[PDB]
Symmetry: D2
Subunit: 400 residues, 4 copies
């Protein structure tokens, strides 16, 4: 029926499908998404921050797309007149031990070409955020916030305007040259090749492939806390902490929203379910397969204490606010409301390392391909990652 299929209606699957039709406006392309609308998971439950690229090492690949995709974003945001707001980000350090890591963030940032990286300290901290403390802080006024779920549906609007079709409520679940079946009998779409970009199910899409199970996706939920509208003037822009460089998580941070709300998060607690957006939502066969994975216990043998304290502050938010008072001490417990959350698609190898790079796997064979992982931030680098994915398309599939 078609010539190319992109399984997954996320910001990665939409930007990759939008990029490949502007390349060649000749192929009949389709997008398969199991939910009603696009950006219903990771790209719909993110912090909304347009990252600049500070934590990443110079000369890396992750820092290449992050600085590029951020520039490609602001270009696409003005092209489509997408509402955005350049708020700026202050990476505040409390102890001197965080300052030593904060200077490593500045040294790694000057080489990634981040616009207007300034290291402030002292009374110059409150001139940008008047309610935040700290000893030293790193300023990046080029960072902004935007509705990434709104940019994702704008990617599909462009994709649909170029002869593309977005098959929604299509939950994939066969050579006829390939035919993709679904949950409803009779729901089948035939095409030449297929590219799968599932979020927390990219590992399960490998089984249809014939790919090896690894790297398995480990769900890490990121809970957000809503600050009451009474005292939201206390947060003007992004207020990030200095995280542990051993983990890709950046820590619970103060970030404004487009509607004026101030969400505090996200955290990094292990989810008992792939799509486990709530604590009580537990799937037995989805964690027994996650805990029997050889790479989990390896990482658990070294980082269990860091995961337990994330869940301890999640069970008792009085401990969470106590840590947040290091930055804004004028925040009480009666000002906090438990809001929604998102779950990360954390890839992991059998050695216990959270996968950092691109992961493309193929078994059906050769005709399929699974972007099982992409460098983060996937939302900021979306258009940049969409190019690198599109350049892996014409090679294996022989396109154009």
């Amino acid at each position: 029926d078609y010539d190319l299929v992109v399984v997954g209606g996320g910001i990665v699957g939409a930007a990759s499908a939008r990029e490949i039709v502007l390349r060649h406006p000749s192929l009949k392309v389709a997008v398969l998404e199991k939910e009603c609308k696009l950006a219903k998971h990771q790209s719909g439950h993110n912090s909304g921050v347009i990252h600049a690229g500070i934590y990443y090492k110079p000369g890396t690949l992750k820092a290449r797309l992050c600085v590029e995709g951020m520039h490609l974003a602001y270009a696409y945001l003005d092209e489509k007149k997408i509402p955005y707001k350049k708020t700026g980000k202050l990476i505040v350090a409390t102890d001197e031990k965080e300052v030593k890591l904060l200077k490593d963030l500045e040294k790694r940032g000057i080489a990634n070409n981040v616009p207007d990286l300034r290291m402030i300290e002292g009374s110059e901290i409150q001139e940008i955020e008047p309610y935040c403390q700290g000893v030293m802080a790193l300023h990046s006024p080029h960072t902004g916030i935007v509705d990434w779920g709104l940019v994702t549906e704008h990617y599909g609007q462009d994709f649909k305007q170029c002869g593309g079709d977005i098959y929604l409520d299509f939950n994939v679940s066969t050579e006829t040259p390939v035919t993709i079946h679904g949950a409803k009998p009779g729901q089948t779409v035939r095409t030449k090749n297929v590219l799968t970009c599932g979020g927390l199910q990219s590992d399960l899409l490998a089984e249809k492939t014939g790919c090896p199970r690894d790297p398995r996706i480990v769900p890490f939920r990121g809970e957000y806390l809503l600050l009451t509208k009474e005292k939201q003037h206390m947060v003007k822009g992004n207020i990030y902490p200095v995280p542990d460089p051993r983990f890709p998580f950046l820590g619970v941070h103060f970030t404004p929203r487009m509607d004026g709300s101030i969400w505090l998060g996200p955290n990094a607690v292990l989810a008992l379910k792939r799509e486990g957006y709530t604590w009580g939502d537990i799937n037995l066969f989805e964690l027994f397969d996650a805990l029997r994975y050889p790479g989990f216990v390896k990482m658990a043998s070294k980082y269990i204490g860091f995961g337990l304290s994330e869940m301890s502050k999640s069970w008792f938010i009085n401990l969470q606010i106590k840590a947040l008072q290091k930055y804004i001490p004028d925040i009480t417990e009666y000002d906090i409301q438990r809001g929604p959350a998102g779950v990360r698609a954390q890839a992991m190898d059998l050695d216990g390392n959270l996968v950092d790079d691109f992961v493309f796997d193929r078994g059906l064979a050769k005709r399929v391909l699974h972007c099982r992982n992409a460098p983060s931030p996937g939302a900021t680098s979306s258009l940049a990652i969409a190019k690198m994915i599109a350049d892996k398309i014409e090679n294996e599939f022989s396109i154009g």
Copy 2:
């Protein structure tokens, strides 16, 4: 925006909305559904059998709606030309004890006048691969895609001017000629209307508490797992083969029915689900788990029928036990001929005394406010809601006309 809104895109929520607009084309009616499509839960995960009424006591409203629903169904299926197959229904009895419970069903079935029962003894001509000692021949029974006819209910509802709101998860009722306002999960998605009706099925109790209705009764999920008979032995079952069920429970037991595509599926069973929408065994929700266990009526029913609940659970853990039970009817089926298939969840209502509620349950908030008196909740409907959909719709329409003055 509208004058009446039916919360729930199930088969009884779409049939009630279809009936209320055909009776009153002067009314702007809307339908709010949280899923993407209509009939996504109970109406889309059922055995598909067009029941005729046998297990139901004569003179009961439950027995009257099923005999009225089956004639309205075949008439509606012929009106829209929806594919259906009228298969036989043999209620086979094995032991002599099942016979004493069975000849009650015949006299109970003929009393409600179902055309046309025939007591058989000595079954290889309606079902050659089946066994037993005595059964009932119900040729008027049939299979159907209840999920497909539910979309036809919504198609008729949209043809007459009604709007179907999909991906609309009712989260909050508020006060605003349209006093009540319904809120969705997405910010900004709101609908103002005059009066509200909720047919949330599995969330009928949860939706009722948002208006002011008590926790009584509560919806207790009972999963109905199905086993798919392999393609090499689909010829062993021609029509529906039902067992002789225990009258103390509304469940009809694991039975043999073909689907519209010719596939023979074995089920469903009756097992407590640890989640309202727990279609799989691993998927459990703690707050919904403890909501069912902390209910006063749960421990009361468990104090008298836990052996039967653990009976179905043990047969679900080890399917070889389920095979030994199904071999009483067709002994030519082994563990190598079945596979794990899909399932459905029953929206079983339970009172504070542990009794599974069966009759109609309409409830509204206490007082004379806006959210009260204007929002009526249908917390339960007599089974089978799929077959009796058109008959229940006429019953619900009369309740809406009486409660909301139309």
Copy 3:
């Protein structure tokens, strides 16, 4: 250097085994190690205390011969040592026609095993023996009785000590090491040491765990089956005069929840067959996670659960809600209710299971592989045929015969 033979186990099996071996060989220096404070602290001290006559067992096997011979040896032992006992009758009652056909099989097995002296009593003559019990047909056995089997174990140790034997209490055997006496036994306490030539273990609930400390395989495995009891209050103690047993399923060694009087006049209801979540799990709450991750990971557990999990869940369900247990007992005594019962103490069965899932009921002797010192000289009795209390003296003669053959004792 200490003893010639050491018996690890203070129960009725190990005590009778040590008593029998010293009576046959007065020159032997034999010792007994018990991990608890006193003899008969577990199975032998938490039982129904009924002296079985040997009805349920098939004719021709050894268990049928051991129970009847052990019962005769018991009454002569109780009369010799002046031990109190009441020869209360046993009445196996059937309530429906299905249990009648199976009770007829119990009559043929009882008359072939020569149990004195059964009679098939009709439903009209049931109250002539039990004026409150109902039923359609029953099987009477007037020569069974009740006795404090825990007290009989103390008498076995008293005879063992009066022949020169030593009983080491509070001695928890933990490891065997090589040393005239090349076997050294170590306790849990530092310095607890006993040198011996040959060891015989009757660990009961830990028979499999003791065997693995020598070189024996994990099979057979000891699966704990707790037997809970109920206390019928005094206000209705007169409704039961003797023993009222139900007609059990022949597929299981469990005899079912029965009415049994005690030596103090009490009436106990039980025991049931509840899977204990602990080797010594006498209560419903005490769980040992490691004893679960090994009892379920055993290849034979799921094989038995695949066929009889509904039977075990039935016993657990009637324990969670005793109103279901009351209705079952009302088939026999229909005028007791939930206000007349109290939860009492329980016992845990040392149920031996093979790799195929079948509950073993024969003699299982095991020793380490090879020709080492820990092997050959340490023989483990993994299982003894039930009832261990009634067949105690009979099993003791056969264990002593096995010890003489295995250890070359003059």
Copy 4:
């Protein structure tokens, strides 16, 4: 009728209290009821075996005065009875500058508590006492010794029996009833009974459960904390000559995992502070649903967990994966790897907790609320100040003073 006063509890506190009450009153028929088979089979028999000098305790308090006097009273008792002991000397190391400020606060407290020959040393002088141990600064208490408190507990019992006292072993107290001897104590066995006039219970892990039998409130409830130890191999035992303690968090009574030699020459690593899912839960898998459901339904449990859940989870994490435990130990002696240790025995702490969630470290005497014979003649010592073993002789004299005023003896 039988005795004048009985002492429920075979531990070192119950034995020393019964020993003290009969030395001051030789005409008092006193008995001791112990549910186990031997004396000191729980806390008094599964401890670190250290004779504390009195460092971490606040000066001027009762807890600081009992340990200092009890240490001198014990050393005099051991020399009198010729009980073997070794003075190894404690050494508290600070690894970073954050712990050195806490270490100096321990110095000031130790000086005020009159700890003999306490000196503060640092990097150059620590290898002079412990060559294999690293660190920034150290607090050297050379008079801290080790002893077998289980052997000392039995020496208390033989002294209690020399003066006419009776020790009832395998006596599981299960029920108190009314009858010159008005109160009757019931055992777990039938007919196992004893009568007396007054009762003093030192149940340790069952301090509260014994008090509930005579009408006392549920508070304070005993919360079980397991103290796990690790056995260092005999090869590397020469690398630890004396006691090596870390700088503990002053917010908790726990002293942390420490290096400690024993009488037989073994070097044990511990104890830790993991929450036991069973009151007598000496192993990881030993749980009890009844003893746990009531442990969670206690109002103070959620409060204490609401503020210190991470400290307890970190201890459990270092016990689940011992590679994290040896890493924390390599901050002191880095030559010890995972191949040098193996899981050993453990002990359970009878930690008392109030309704607000604070770990009570003071005396808690309780009696029945009514005015009957049970509610006025059974005094329950629901908690004793830490440490119980070192302060054994000092606590016994004040417990004897309490029962002398409570019962007018």
